[model samples]
Target: TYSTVSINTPPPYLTLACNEKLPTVLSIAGTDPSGGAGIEADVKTITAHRCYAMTCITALNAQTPVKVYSINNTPKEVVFQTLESNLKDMKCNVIKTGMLTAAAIEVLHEKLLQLGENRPKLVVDPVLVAKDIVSLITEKVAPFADILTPNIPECYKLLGEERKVNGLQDIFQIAKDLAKITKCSNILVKGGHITDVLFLGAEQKFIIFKGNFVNTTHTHGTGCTLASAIASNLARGYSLPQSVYGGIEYVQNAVAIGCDVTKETVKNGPINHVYAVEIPLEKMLSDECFTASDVIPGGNFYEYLINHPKVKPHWDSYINHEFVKKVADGTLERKKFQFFIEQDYAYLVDYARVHCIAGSKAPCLEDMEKELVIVGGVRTEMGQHEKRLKEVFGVKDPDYFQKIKRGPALRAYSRYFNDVSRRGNWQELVASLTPCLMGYGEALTKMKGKVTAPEGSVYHEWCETYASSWYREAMDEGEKLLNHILETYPPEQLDTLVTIYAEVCELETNFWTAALEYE
Candidate 1:
């Protein structure tokens, strides 16, 4: 049985590429045909804009050195034939002439005359050769051009002399004069390093585009490249002003990130046109490689973390601290313990708030609920601290909790939580918190038989709470959460998680050290 293929329910893993038809441009020029200038420049510029490109080459016979003596132009018959077919079949809307000869222009203007009123928009690069070439451009195609992009040197040749430059107005006058001379409705006289002037002849409006110039001699094809960019923009239906602005911006960026394709006393180099192409290519391959490179040691991320060199020093200092030893043997100062209890009571509220933030950013409902459950556990622990303060060390003040002053260590820890909440994602926030939870249980295990601080007393019960079954149960989930985060995280970013865990462990160690050395 034959069935119609359904676009909506197509085969799995099938993908579609490129939705809209490409805005296309036809470039009619050839100079340094192999170099990064002229036709190659136009193709690179259009390709860089993600537009379809078409070309009609004027095959040159090497017009050697600066001064043009005699140019061996492409056959007139071939030039006209290219214009007829490409314009007829290629579906191009913009015409770019980077290095025009008299014969090519004569053939090109013939096609425009035939297509008349329905002709594609025109842009001229005006690659300077001699006086005759300049005069022919004004006589043949200037009236039909959409835009003319001339640099400071080319602008001088077009004017047949030098124009004194002092400020923006001086450049503005030059653009206006070129607009009249070239018969182009739009003129962009590039100041090379200053603001560019685009004089719109029809509206009599002058647009000054800011220059983001760089120190480099690699801008060999900037003129032809920029004009093609403008053509690409126009064919894509951007406003004339916006097109010129975007082309100028793109050219400057290309100049800044120059290419290194040239060698041997490199005179002029090409701008990096394929810069954007390399980006997605790297992302498509490197992402999978990142996941394949990193794996949890012995299938347990928590065990690996504490043993990792980056974390082991801080983890060792935290669990084997002198303060925990004092609390275990009943030798700890009561006032210092009181300081810790009060400060920690203040600390729990911020800790719970950060848990709420982590829950908000959590990947799944189950992960979110785990953070909420931890928050509930924090509430119960706060109540236990309140009981210890009031009943065990009886104070008659009801406002005591509100009045408890937080010292430096508590403030520092709270600041870290605030930073994680604001700047870090859920995975990093979870890693930042895991050390506090896991370190407590591990430290209490070390105090299993060493506790002689009057059993069932404040210090005894406080030290004993972390080793309880409920606390160990919480530790188990924290371990599972560390592994859970790895499933969604980029594997190579394990170092980020490791750093957060190590830093937080150091913060945990300092909290205990501050209590031990309290004045």
Candidate 2:
């Protein structure tokens, strides 16, 4: 008799590892609620880089890529209040300023004096787009800003000239000229030419951060995203060059993979800021104890799966498969049997891998270890296959199984497993894994009094394997596992489970059909 591995859960409390230390950035900007640019874009970028973001908006831009609808500046005192509270109470490593109104600047300037030596590092995105800040920023805040990030148009406004660009050297000089005039220690002059000139004033050196050119006009918030990203990296203890280098690449990647948030009337659009953020729920299985355990009432899954309309037909063909029939009658060729054995060997290897994944996603230690324990048994099954091949089939090569390329049938099944394991939820995965175990047990019962295969032969052993009294214990317990799935799985999603089981049963039928039809 074979043994069954069972794992059940009581929904234990989740234990987590938390030191709670994260670098923070304060984004001082206007609101762009459509989120293409401004404060929202800053928060999105900072969060994307795994840094915490806080906001202090100076104005609200009723804006989108289509047009700038209107502008309403926050009051000077409120800007002062928010900015002070953020810096005063929070652990902010960097302050990134964008779209600063005169009022915001007045407050921020006074706040800087009060907090002088203890001020957070500044990364100023000196936006001059429809503002009264060209002269004001060049004198008021640029000197205190750790870095001045301005694009060509913004740079021209700050310098009070529309500078002519001839080459990369011209851009490099522009960055230097901006740094010297603005009195900022670092200046990054961005260009539509897809080049950024980083002028390190302390070193009096320039590092040309040449990035790939994207041949699209969908670059709405490239500057803001870069500045926030740079601040994020800087907050995390990265060098300025390294920070800017990463920021340039991040923005370039964003531009290259731009998002579609604009109307057809608008040619330019915002780059995707949250491209790197994982969909929160989709990645939560690893943080198990996620949801409760499952039920078909009375906790029986085999009855319902075999009884369901979609699965019943597929289950019928799977359990009463011709391949198993031939093996029972001892008529299936030895080579075909070996082929079945070989493909199954490859199948369970993937099976073991998926179980380990399920183990990690399981709720409690007992339920989790059930998966690993099953994998342990699966390992034994594979060893048995190895022995049958070497001793019974005269396979002398140790590398024989290694050299065995899975035929189309096994490859197709493997592809099926790969897809399900990736996008399918944990409950769906259990449904996908159920048919194989259930059908084999049912296949034996359906073959009753039909076994003419002689004693001690591979055919008899193969047919009789699942019929072993111990094997029934696994089947009975497996039914219990199925009921648990129904208990845990959403009621509405039962159909998806049904479809998956049916589809997998179809794959199983084809699996045996492959060996039966083998030449």
Candidate 3:
């Protein structure tokens, strides 16, 4: 049955703590219609950090990564007016400048002088890829700035000399020299090709941020993104070191998870700027609402999943696994069963935790209660295992269960569940959890009446535990729950749900296979 629901659109800013005033950043920069650099990248970086962004466009460029076609500068009067208006009307915490024109520099210089003691913190990205009056702006802007960020090539240009960067010490010397020349107290010398180095001028210290060097041509706007991210963090009251650390990590991730949104022939492309951004429309649909129900028609999810081409191979391998077959015929080694049970016990603890997380994240009270009921069942299942261990297996030591070391299969399965619970939404978590519940009953049902294990023996009792009428009823409920998820999830992203199910089923298969091969 579909739940009747209403939708509400709250301000996106509410994702922060209550009574929260987000840090505000003003980006005075150019516009790239291609969206790779300048104001677009700055705003995207700032918003991704959960900060408010305002813009003063200095120039508009008809440009892409392929080439720059044209550039139109905003008049100096307009730049002055834009800065004045934003400062007058907004709560500005930081000002980040990028890709500045001459007139834009003049206006920013005037504004900095006007604000003087009341000026907001400034982060300058010297598209000093500039020679004309670079000295004048350096004299006016650098001393007033809190941080100056320049990539390796830009650092050489700022220093008016190129030095060999054969080692970390070489880069370190350049950072110190740039700080002295630019008069900025903090300098982050970006070594995107190597390792980033941050020089704390006042502290006389260095923080080297080391990460995997992503080798790709999709680094179109990394400089702008890094500077704005730092500005956003600083505005949020983070210390310079913490802000730089976060900024570097964010940019590195963006570069590593590069996007493919450009012409196939284009060699250089933009980095994925919205990598951390949650799709607003997706979140709206995910919330408890009737708005999306009609879009996703319900069906038999369990049958559909088992029959799905993407899922059937794994599902077949799981339900008809050699481990279950051996147990059905009483051929599996006793030690292997004990190993699986001990590993399963540890795994159940993690499963129970994931179900609790699902309950907390469920869309409605009814769904939440359903998740909790499963968790309760999990506790009972664990108790039954404890009884079997103590009574049948002659497990005398009470701490024996806690002492079991998890094998690779159990560890991998638990790790997958933890990851999905952390990163995925409610429906996806449900998809990942369903395979275990349904696959057990289906496996037992398929191998029905084939058991050669003696009646009332440990192996026979274990098989019957899943094939029982009560367990069958639980499987039926699981089927309906899977259908419910399909009815509420986005159609385009249904593959992601299917992928989770398939991956978990493979994990389940591996879990049993490990026991079958246990020595």
Candidate 4:
């Protein structure tokens, strides 16, 4: 089916470029040994949304729905150390807390006070009333909180002067009074079972986050999960209200697709955090190794890619780059080295996740294994980047690894997956991935041995790694696959292959350029 086309156009959203990445959230809460609630649930829920998570345990509970075994409150010093260490070594864009202890409250208050302008935003879940447990959300900790989430019972606690709440007025009064008392800027009275009223500013704006209050026993951990999810959304740059909306939606969907994890007799259970998460080993079934075909509805990604403007320019340049000559000869500048490493660092994490998704969506076992091998190499490369970041860049925060502000190039790359995952076939995916693998090796091999950077330096090691014999072998394998695709796949769809190849080359270049501009 060898076909040629001089025609070119761009896809709507794909034509534009922006920088965005996954959110990073931290939970300062107690741990439920049952894993249904508290920090554990927070971790699971946040991770489910593709956000990174860090935890500062406020308490440890040895309790299940059946009975309470033992409750050990976290010491103040431990909370302090944990938060300090976590914040020191990680970049938590937002914080959410649940089932807090007195110590947890004090430490959190002190840190917030210390940071002043630099303090991270907060999400307060009124676990005292919802879980009916001991809580650290005292009047003292309330004022500084950005958002406080409470239910009817918790609202009652906030306004010690209680009136029997019966209707909308009651809900409005509770939200208003709690905001007045706690001094939190906004309040979400989560009446998931009843009615949720959102109150902020003088204008009483509200949206009922309607959900099937499943009468089943699986209502456990909903509070902590929602709060953590909201925090994750906020970290990812969503507004507080927007985050709350997404959090509610995500949680509701998760609850609706509940899993049967608990024993048959347990009266109350937890929703599945991994419900939407795809398992890798399960999908690999085909020999040709393209798994996205089944998951993608129409299996027609070529049309969109061919017309995608975002891919068009880069695609055109890539198939026509003079850099191919420089790469083959290794005559590129030291500046190019910086760009390559930085872009590669950014690429590996996204590559890992894409492989995870591919593994989950693979058609057969062998395909899944191939994806896993890609993931393994991604892991190795990530470690190399970490070493470079630490030794060369002095990065100490664990959060630094997650908080990469994906440049335009990364965003374009991610958008490519989203487009394909929603529309592309398996062969198209393979086509899209080919250039990244092939180009790096080609670029490095071109510069081999004529090493200019000081030997044993971070830059030198980074350069050598790509140019190493082993890396070249991978490049050889990639080239063979590229040729193989040409032979085995539909030859008529050469346009799709060309477009994918070109876009990736430009993305690869811009990725380097971003680091080159970095201070």
Clash count for candidate 4 is 17
lDDT at residue 25 of model 3 (Cα atoms)? 96
User: Residue 160 in model 2: shift from native, Å?
Assistant: 1.7
Candidate with the larger TM-score of 1 and 3: 3
Better of 1 and 3 by lDDT: 3
Which candidate, 1 or 2, has the higher lDDT?
Answer: 2
Candidate 1 error regions (>4 Å): 1-19, 33-35, 61-72, 279-519
Ranking by lDDT: 3, 2, 1, 4
What is the C-alpha lDDT profile of model 2 across 1-519, one tens digit per residue? 544433434324422425557899999998887788899999999999989999998997798877789999998989988987877688989999988888998998898788889888999997776845777788788888889888888877787778778898888778888878888989888886667888889898888876786688888887789999999999999999999999999988888877877777776788977776667545344346544223210446678778889888888899989898888887888899888888888778888888887887676789898888889999789899999998889686798888776888788888887778876777778788888787897798778768998889888876788888788888787778778777677788788888999999999998989999888
Off by over 4 Å in 4: 1-22, 129-136, 192-194, 202-204, 283-519
TM-score of each: 0.54, 0.55, 0.69, 0.51
Q: How well is each residue in 1-519 modelled by candidate 3, as lDDT tens digits?
A: 546544565755675567679899999999888889889999989989999999999998788999888889899889889999999999999999998878887888888988889999999987865266577657777888899988888887777888986889999999999888888989988775558888999989999988786779898998899999999999999999999998888988999998998988786899887887778877676666436466453358778778999999999999989888899998898888988887888888888889899999988999889889989899789888999888878677888877889899988998999999998888888899899899999899988989899999989988998999999998888888888777688789988888899999999999998988888
Model 4, position 103: C-alpha lDDT score? 78
User: Which residue pairs come into collision in candidate 3?
Assistant: none
Identify the leading candidate in terms of TM-score: 3
Count: clashes, candidate 3: 0
The positional error of residue 3 in candidate 3, measured at the CA in angstroms, is 24
